[PDB]
Ligand binder design. Structure first.
Ligand code: MG
Ligand code: MG
Ligand code: MG
Ligand code: MG
Ligand code: MG
Ligand code: MG
Ligand code: MG
Ligand code: MG
Ligand code: MG
Ligand code: MG
Ligand code: MG
Ligand code: MG
Ligand code: MG
Ligand code: MG
Ligand code: MG
Ligand code: MG
Ligand code: MG
Ligand code: MG
Ligand code: MG
Ligand code: MG
Ligand code: MG
Ligand code: MG
Ligand code: MG
Ligand code: MG
Ligand code: MG
Ligand code: MG
Ligand code: MG
Ligand code: MG
Ligand code: MG
Ligand code: MG
Ligand code: MG
Ligand code: MG
Ligand code: MG
Ligand code: MG
Ligand code: MG
Ligand code: MG
Ligand code: MG
Ligand code: MG
Ligand code: MG
Ligand code: MG
Ligand code: MG
Ligand code: MG
Ligand code: MG
Ligand code: MG
Ligand code: MG
Ligand code: MG
Ligand code: MG
Ligand code: MG
Ligand code: MG
Lengths: 197, 137, 110, 117, 63
RNA sequence: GCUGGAGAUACGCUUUGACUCGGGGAUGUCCGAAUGGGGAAACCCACCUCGUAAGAGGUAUCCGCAAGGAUGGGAACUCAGGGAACUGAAACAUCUCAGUACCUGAAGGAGAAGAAAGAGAAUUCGAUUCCGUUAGUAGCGGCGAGCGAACCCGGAUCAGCCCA
RNA sequence: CUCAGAAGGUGAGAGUCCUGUAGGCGAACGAGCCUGAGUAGGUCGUUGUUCGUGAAACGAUGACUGAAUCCGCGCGGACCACCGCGCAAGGCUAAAUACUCCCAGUGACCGAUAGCGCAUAGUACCGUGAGGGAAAGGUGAAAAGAACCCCGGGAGGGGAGUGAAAGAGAACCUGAAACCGUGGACUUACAAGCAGUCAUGGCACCUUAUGCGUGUUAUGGCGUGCCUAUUGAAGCAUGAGCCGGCGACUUAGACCUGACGUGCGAGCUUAAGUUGAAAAACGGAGGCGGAGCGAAAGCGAGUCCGAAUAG
């Protein structure tokens, strides 16, 4: 339901679902996204069983001390940890329909204020970043807003020097997180609305 | 949008029971009452006279058909219901079993459905609406 | 133990060269490079000075004295100069000493 | 992630130790004994907040029938006769203070003695 | 995992639709013949009361 | 520039390119599988040949005619011979822990296994291995505690070659 | 400026001061008629496989025995016939698999009682031995590491000087608490005490602070530590010298069963893996609704008992 930019034009239309971003739909997609990448790298040696320490220190009875039996246990300084973190997974399969629904609500929430559609190419001389900065300045991308960019030609991204600017993705790299993370979204107008099926 | 203004749907998330941790709730004993309730847990379907101890009458095998009530079959509006292996039915328990149509409701219309077997009266209600059914031969 | 210099043990100047401090006290001051210490990253120059009272050991000096001596710095005196100020510099070309590269900034050699 | 006790225990502990102030001996300088002292101090606090009102009732009563007997009456008698006289409904606090202003308490005694003959 | 206890299999339980637990009728099941005709005839119910939860967890899928 | 950590003074080396880095050679006492002989590891005693001596080289057993090969070592992994109990069964013999622990042997960068006298009930498949799944199904069981497949199907990888 | 905003360093935080895979180049010469007999088969003792002697096939064997060969031989879970699948008694065989002494990168891992036992040591120390086995970090930006002077044999200190700072001085960041002391306010030598609490007077001070308190104190009232365990705890029942730090309801699995929430909804979802990773997509093998009754055949809105009537 939104228009275009420089390389050409379009007057583009497509249906946008009502965003549940602040709702659990977008919030769920973001949480699944961050959790999916987790490294599970918590290995404490904590279990009494790998602390490297001995046998049976002294007398079960009649020494006048406290009772203990080995030196490898959570009550002992130096021993293991009860219930220490172990390496593990964190990843799970969020339902697919919620994936696509989230990403669509993402795009949508940006169309409600400030999304932009790069029309079948920008003019950037060679690959020089300075001309990207000129191009974006002439498309109203100040120096201010953090912005995300999606495209496919190598060169236009090869002005991908984030300077409080230019977080960069190709096609299919899109994700609810990376767009929701930025203010304006400079979506690549082409496959930006090549309708599925 | 506001990544700080993402809000989980109220409900959904609920906090874990942190057990030990104070006479502000669930103190010394951790919801366990002073008992022969102690770490290394042991049992779930057992007392000692057992009483799931009644006697048994035993067959080993079984085999059964995929079910196709004709009621959905008849309101279909597209008649001559010979299923390609994929479509509509058997999604649960599809390719491992055989089909058998049965005399759940009716709507009356012509239709030639070719299930692997069928109830005697689905022939009654299918042939009565001028409708063949090809049991495999 | 903390490890030494991380500058790939590479000094950016010879013991011959003139140089200027560009930071701290002595900024703008200039001198010859009386001692280069790459692996520890330290630079002797006639700029910084310090009054070292060596403790009297009677080693020809029963009662000790206070010497005036220059105390070394590191990669904070700026490299060579030419338009009268410090400069970034670039590898150059061959000369009549054609086995050598020289240096330059927005200019000539050193 | 680890999450050791760090700052938290020392701060609760200092809160108790500062409640301690002029507590004799370890009661004010060792944490555990300060905490435990404050348990029993809770007991004393709440109950005394109740009791003080029994206390001042008792004191006003003492003074009131002291004054009542200065004139040949007594608390039972003076309080009842005042009650019989178009219910005065002065508090027992207030009747004391009029036992600091004798000329009035006197007339209250004559008035109670009236509504009683 | 969570295996079902095979002792409950052909043993007098079965799962009625609507989630109720089956059982068989036991007393004088075998080795008794001064029992009355109806008594020998009395087996075959399986409606069974406040045990059901445990009988259910005896059989996950109704084997 | 260097002159090891070392934070130390003195002697110095380096445009003939030191130092540091990448690569090869050469030197490498004595002990250790140790192996000339012995031995309480690093030591004590010899014999044969070459040599002016000083010094150099040889001297264990087991396969081989011979070239040549083997002794020993190696975190965990692999195969193999041998092989527990605590423990569960609310006691305990069968059963379980469990072919786990441990010992021993053999080897490599992996090993094992492998090319249907098969799987299996479609006259289907087409070496082996590993993953998913079937499935806690089929079964095994003081039919107790409990133990528990495979075929089909989806993937990783995919070769078959030589003998009597 | 930017194909280079990764990162470290530099007197506090540097895109442009230094070191820098963004990109680019790079070596002498160095890595990469036959077809298996003491066999198959068998009996005795045993065992693997879901295989506990069970109707127990089959493989594997320790003792004894012991055949056929293409109208031939093994197998299909006692066994027989038919039907069907194979060719033993000879060998070799990459890759998909496992592991981490070693190396690199990374981390909703640790950061000096944590993290390996070790900020390095299998040391010190303990044991004849096998074996066991510690704690321990921090000047400053830069040694400019305190010449000189004073008391002292020294140790230690006070000055001077360096330094932003010595409120960093080598017993060298912060520097809590228990514990020991000095000085000051208010106080105590007729007094019975879980040590507090309420009340009031006295004295003292006024930086969240002059009705306001804050600190202390005299006298009055009241008042049986904590926890655990228990019918019942001040208990002459357990535990504890004190403080600091360590210290206990977790993790897992396509497991199960509930509640809440979300996406689809008569339908709902993938796993192993493949391709891309500054991010995800693909992948219907399979799993769950969908029909029940029965011991099972099986029949099916019906199904079981039973000779049709009862449940
Ligand atoms: Mg004791
Ligand atoms: Mg540790
Ligand atoms: Mg609660
Ligand atoms: Mg208890
Ligand atoms: Mg336990
Ligand atoms: Mg009252
Ligand atoms: Mg599994
Ligand atoms: Mg049933
Ligand atoms: Mg040095
Ligand atoms: Mg020898
Ligand atoms: Mg030899
Ligand atoms: Mg020997
Ligand atoms: Mg037992
Ligand atoms: Mg071994
Ligand atoms: Mg070996
Ligand atoms: Mg396959
Ligand atoms: Mg600037
Ligand atoms: Mg045999
Ligand atoms: Mg046998
Ligand atoms: Mg048995
Ligand atoms: Mg047979
Ligand atoms: Mg056999
Ligand atoms: Mg058969
Ligand atoms: Mg053959
Ligand atoms: Mg941390
Ligand atoms: Mg440590
Ligand atoms: Mg410490
Ligand atoms: Mg000793
Ligand atoms: Mg010793
Ligand atoms: Mg230092
Ligand atoms: Mg002196
Ligand atoms: Mg001194
Ligand atoms: Mg000082
Ligand atoms: Mg200090
Ligand atoms: Mg100290
Ligand atoms: Mg000192
Ligand atoms: Mg000293
Ligand atoms: Mg500091
Ligand atoms: Mg300090
Ligand atoms: Mg004094
Ligand atoms: Mg004092
Ligand atoms: Mg007195
Ligand atoms: Mg008092
Ligand atoms: Mg008792
Ligand atoms: Mg009592
Ligand atoms: Mg006592
Ligand atoms: Mg006690
Ligand atoms: Mg004691
Ligand atoms: Mg599941």
């Amino acid at each position: 339901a939104q228009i275009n930019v420089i390389g050409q034009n379009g007057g583009r239309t497509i249906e946008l679902p009502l965003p549940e971003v602040n709702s659990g739909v977008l919030h769920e997609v973001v949480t699944w996204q961050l959790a999916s990448r987790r490294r599970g790298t918590a290995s404490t040696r904590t279990r009494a069983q790998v602390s490297k320490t001995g046998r049976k220190m002294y007398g079960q009875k009649g020494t006048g001390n406290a009772r203990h039996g080995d030196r490898s246990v959570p009550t002992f300084v130096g021993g293991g940890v009860a219930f220490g973190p172990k390496p593990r997974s964190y990843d799970y399969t969020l339902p697919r329909q919620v994936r696509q629904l989230g990403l669509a609500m993402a795009i949508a929430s940006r169309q409600e204020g400030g999304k932009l559609v790069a029309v079948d190419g920008f003019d950037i001389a060679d690959a020089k970043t300075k001309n990207f900065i000129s191009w974006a300045k002439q498309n109203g991308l100040d120096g201010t807003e953090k912005v995300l960019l999606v495209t496919d030609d190598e060169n236009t991204r090869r002005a991908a020097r984030n300077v409080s600017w230019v977080s960069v993705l190709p096609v299919a790299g899109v994700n609810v997180y990376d767009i929701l993370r930025h203010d304006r979204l400079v979506i690549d107008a082409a496959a930006l609305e090549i309708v599925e099926e | 949008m506001k990544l700080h203004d993402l809000k989980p749907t109220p409900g959904s998330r609920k906090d874990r029971k942190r057990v030990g941790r104070g006479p502000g709730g669930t103190d010394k004993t951790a919801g366990r009452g002073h008992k022969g309730q102690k770490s290394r847990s042991g049992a779930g379907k057992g007392a000692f006279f057992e009483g799931g101890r009644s006697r048994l009458i035993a067959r080993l095998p079984k085999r059964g058909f995929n079910n196709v009530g004709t009621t959905y079959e008849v309101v279909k509006l597209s008649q001559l219901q010979d299923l390609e292996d994929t479509t509509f039915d058997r999604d649960t328990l599809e390719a491992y079993r055989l089909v058998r149509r049965k005399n759940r409701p009716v709507k009356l219309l012509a239709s030639g459905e070719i299930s692997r077997a069928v109830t005697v009266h689905v022939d009654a209600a299918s042939a009565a609406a001028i409708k063949a059914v090809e049991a495999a031969g | 133990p903390s490890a030494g210099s991380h500058h790939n043990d590479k000094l950016h100047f010879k013991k011959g060269d003139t140089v200027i401090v560009l930071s701290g006290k002595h900024k703008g001051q200039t001198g010859k490079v009386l001692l280069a210490l790459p692996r520890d990253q330290k630079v002797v120059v006639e700029g910084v000075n310090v009054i070292t009272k060596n403790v009297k050991p009677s080693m020809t000096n029963p009662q000790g004295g206070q010497e005036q001596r220059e105390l070394a710095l590191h990669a904070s005196k700026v490299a060579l100069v030419d338009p009268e100020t410090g400069k970034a510099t670039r590898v150059r070309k061959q000369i009549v000493d054609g086995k050598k590269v020289r240096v330059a900034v927005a200019s000539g050699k050193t | 992630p680890r999450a050791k006790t760090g700052i938290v225990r020392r701060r609760r502990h200092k809160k108790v130790l500062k409640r301690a102030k002029g507590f004799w001996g370890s009661r004010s300088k060792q944490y555990r004994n300060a905490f435990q002292t404050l348990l029993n101090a809770a007991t004393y606090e709440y109950r005394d907040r109740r009791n003080k009102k029994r206390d001042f009732r008792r004191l006003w009563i003492q003074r009131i029938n002291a004054g009542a007997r200065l004139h040949g009456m007594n608390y039972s008698t003076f309080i009842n006769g005042l009650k019989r006289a178009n219910i005065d409904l002065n508090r027992k606090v207030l009747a004391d203070i009029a036992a600091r202003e004798p000329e009035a308490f006197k007339a209250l005694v004559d008035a109670s003695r009236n509504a009683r003959q | 995992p969570k295996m079902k206890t095979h002792k409950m299999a052909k043993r007098r339980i079965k799962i009625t639709g609507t989630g109720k637990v089956m059982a068989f009728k036991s007393g004088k099941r075998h080795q008794n013949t001064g029992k009355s005709g109806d008594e020998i005839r009395g087996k075959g119910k399986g409606f069974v009361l406040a045990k059901a939860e445990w009988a259910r967890m005896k059989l996950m899928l109704p084997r």
